[PDB]
């Protein structure tokens, strides 16, 4: 409208905040030790 921009600041109902989400947890690795070397077996279910 060419007349004028009225007031009327409208609050945004759903603002972003920092909440806590439940994140996944990768399956426990299998530790396999050697001399000065750490062989680590892995088998994830999702790319980690």
């Amino acid at each position: 409208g060419e007349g004028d921009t009225f007031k009327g600041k409208l609050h945004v109902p759903f603002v972003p905040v920092k909440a806590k989400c439940i994140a996944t947890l990768a399956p426990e690795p299998l530790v396999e030790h050697k001399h000065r070397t750490l062989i680590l077996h892995l088998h994830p279910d999702h790319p980690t």
């Binding site: 060419e2 945004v12 603002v15 972003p16 030790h33 050697k34 001399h35 000065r36």
Partner: protein, 400 residues
């Protein structure tokens, strides 16, 4: 008295030092560094986040062009298009066929997400490091002190007086340019304020979250509406903060050497084990006891039971004490070959007691000082078999 001594900058190790002030019985001191926060000086540069292209309602004149006004909004783009013929749910609404013009405009505004999701840029100065020293000397056995690192600030904690530092190495994992994103800190090189290129990092830069003015080089571009439909088709580079949000490198929390640690804080660098600290401590004179009162423990003998060439307390040894009186007496090996787990041992009249120890040397030829009585526990050690524990409880390896 003023036991000046340089000790390695580590967390899990007692600095068992003896105070041999003549005229009184020597006393042992234990020093451990619980915290090694660095806290370098910082200065906020600006804040970046994903932007929102707030498009105001366009103004359409049915017959006759309209010159635009250069608004002071950041990256405000304005253009007027000719040959428009908008249909809007009730058919067309301008009876002219050619003089109809739409004025469209747009500008960049910080998103609501900038409040809680926003990167931070900083410049790093030298700063000054602090530490949490734990003192266990004489009979106090407990003292929690937070101290600085400058070689000038004393620590008159309880009754003991301590001076620590300055640190021998000025190493800092933080570089000149650091970027903080919520919880992770990246040593990225943000260019400068007001110079961000579109699409790259810092496409829009704001001095503070509350700063009204900002700088948004986003290469925003308007385009003509097609087929006469009232909208403001704008083409722009994708949000430069969304980029590098999926392409950020490994965090400084996992590339900093010497096993440093960082947190949501003044940006300290906890437990950066590196270098040595010139500790000088003035103990209270009250805790000293006259040399003539302590028992004489001469004519002693030392021999090991078993020793292992291991990171753990792998050494067990027995001493044939030959004392005069009965009481407590602290023990220590001045040589760095081995470390002693025990702090003080009660002696009966010519008793015999065990001690635990650790050493990195196959044949430990180390003196043992027991209330002014030297003895060498020459012996041999045995190789361990397991390769999995925490980092050592001795860790003073030398030639062997």
């Amino acid at each position: 008295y003023e036991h000046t001594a340089v000790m390695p900058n580590k967390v899990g190790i007692p600095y068992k030092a003896l105070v041999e002030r003549p005229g009184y019985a020597p006393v042992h001191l234990q020093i451990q560094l619980v915290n090694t926060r660095i806290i370098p000086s910082t200065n906020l540069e600006y804040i970046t986040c994903k932007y929102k292209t707030k498009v105001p309602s366009p103004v359409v004149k049915c017959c006759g062009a309209t010159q635009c006004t250069s608004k002071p909004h950041p990256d405000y783009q304005c253009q007027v298009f000719t040959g428009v013929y908008p249909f809007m749910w009730g058919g067309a609404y301008c009876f002219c066929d050619t003089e109809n013009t739409q004025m469209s405009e747009a500008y960049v505004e910080r998103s609501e997400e900038c409040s809680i999701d926003h990167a931070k840029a900083y410049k790093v100065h030298t700063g000054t490091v602090q530490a949490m020293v734990n003192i266990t000397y004489g009979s106090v056995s407990w003292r929690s002190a937070d101290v600085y690192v400058n070689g000038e600030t004393p620590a008159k904690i309880g009754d003991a007086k301590l001076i620590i530092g300055p640190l021998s190495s000025a190493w800092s994992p933080f570089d000149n340019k650091v970027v903080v994103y919520g919880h992770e800190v990246y040593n990225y090189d943000f260019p400068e304020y007001g110079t961000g290129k579109a699409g790259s990092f810092g496409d829009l830069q704001s001095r503070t979250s509350t700063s009204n003015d900002l700088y948004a080089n986003t290469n925003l571009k308007l385009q003509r509406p097609q087929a006469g439909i009232v909208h403001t088709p704008f083409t722009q580079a994708p949000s430069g903060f969304e980029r590098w949000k999926r392409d950020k490198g490994a965090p400084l929390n996992d590339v900093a050497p010497f096993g440093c640690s960082i947190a949501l804080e003044p940006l300290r660098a906890e437990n950066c084990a590196v270098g040595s600290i010139p500790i000088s401590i003035d103990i209270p004179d009250a805790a000293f006891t006259r040399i003539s009162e302590t028992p004489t423990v001469s004519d002693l003998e030392c021999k090991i039971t078993e020793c292992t060439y291991a990171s753990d307390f792998g050494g067990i040894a027995t001493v044939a004490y030959k004392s005069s009186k009965a009481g407590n007496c602290p023990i220590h090996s001045p040589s760095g070959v081995a470390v002693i787990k025990e702090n003080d041992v009660t002696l009966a009249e010519s008793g015999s007691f065990t001690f635990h120890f650790s050493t990195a040397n196959i044949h430990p030829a180390f003196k043992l000082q027991v209330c002014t009585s030297a003895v060498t526990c020459k012996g041999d050690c045995k190789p361990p078999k397991d390769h999995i524990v925490d980092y050592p409880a001795q860790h003073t390896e030398s030639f062997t």
